[PDB]
Design a protein around this ligand. Structure first.
Ligand SMILES: COC(=O)c1ccc(O)cc1
Ligand SMILES: COC(=O)c1ccc(O)cc1
Ligand SMILES: Nc1nc2ccccc2[nH]1
Lengths: 188, 185
């Protein structure tokens, strides 16, 4: 990840005017849509939290959690730490990132800070559901000037995305003011 | 450097009891001793600053500044960012690190933050002197409980080194309370 840390602008885009900041969300959303399309129900929920973090969750199969034979860490960690631009870029430029994977009846949890895992991916409990949740806090060391998520930029993009992804429910939530939208196109 | 960031204790030593914190200084000092050996005068200065950073200076030749043909960046940056455990470990676990190299009539400067160079090694002026200086601010995200440098832990180790490295002068300075020592065999 040091290559991304060395020149963030080359990977995420302009880190001053807010375009790079919102690209962080849309990179995560693209991965969530890929996960949602693999299942039948297919819903993602994008939430803008009051601390200016954004969480994206889906009810798909869940990111692979088993240990990678070569890398010697969870497949999830390999995806988060090895270089669309990839979620590893988002992780690298996030001062905090929370990963929660529900898979094979188990809840898996891991925390990153500036791309560095704070502990190995851990099974913390049980669940009947499946899916992946990524919540990230953009690094204020990288993202300057424009540091807050604009609802309209996300809402417009997710609406456009819904028509290209049939059967995928996309919910948008703003916990700062309680604003909510639901984009679900069932065509084809 | 991510391997070091992932498990800091395994590279530097215990990050809670002050062991790892002081090893950061000793790793930099080992490099300074190598430089202050092939030079003439042969002196190192270790300074504890009021803002809880430590700087190590030598009056050697200056570490190589030219571009590493394989890596495509300055030889100095390769030493600071690629894996005694090496100064790259100290860089990775320092919230800031300042590098100043005086070599071939030129002063060179570079700043790192958590092991990440903020710009390429750059020529900032002219000088007749030679040597290298590294000042580092240990990361308070890594180093907990014992965060401040104890003078006597440094003084003890630098004394041991002065006997082993008989040709080298070692000065220790504390800018917090004005305390100082000069170890020379
Ligand atoms: C690579 O997968 C992800 O990073 C991801 C993030 C959020 C999701 O909801 C699903 C996948
Ligand atoms: C190898 O380069 C160094 O890291 C270094 C640090 C302090 C010195 O005084 C000399 C070299
Ligand atoms: N604050 C901060 N910034 C960082 C950048 C890279 C790795 C760790 C870091 N901690």
């Amino acid at each position: 990840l040091d290559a991304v840390r060395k020149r963030p602008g080359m990977y995420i885009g302009d880190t001053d005017d807010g375009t790079g900041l919102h690209h962080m969300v849309f990179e995560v959303v693209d991965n969530a849509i890929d996960e949602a399309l693999a299942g039948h129900c297919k819903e993602i929920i994008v939430t803008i939290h009051a601390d200016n973090s954004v969480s994206v969750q889906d009810d798909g199969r869940g990111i692979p959690t088993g240990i990678h034979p070569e890398e010697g860490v969870s497949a999830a960690e390999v995806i988060m730490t090895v270089l669309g631009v990839g979620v590893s870029v988002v992780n690298a430029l996030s001062q905090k990132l929370e990963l929660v994977i529900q898979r094979e009846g188990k809840i898996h949890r891991q925390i990153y800070e500036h791309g560095v895992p704070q502990a190995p991916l851990a099974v913390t409990g049980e669940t009947e559901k499946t899916g992946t949740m990524v919540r990230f806090w953009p690094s204020l060391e990288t993202f300057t000037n424009v540091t807050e998520f604009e609802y309209e930029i996300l809402a417009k993009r997710l609406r456009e995305l819904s028509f290209l992804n049939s059967g995928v429910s996309i919910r948008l939530r703003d916990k700062r003011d309680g604003k909510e939208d639901h984009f679900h196109y069932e065509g084809g």
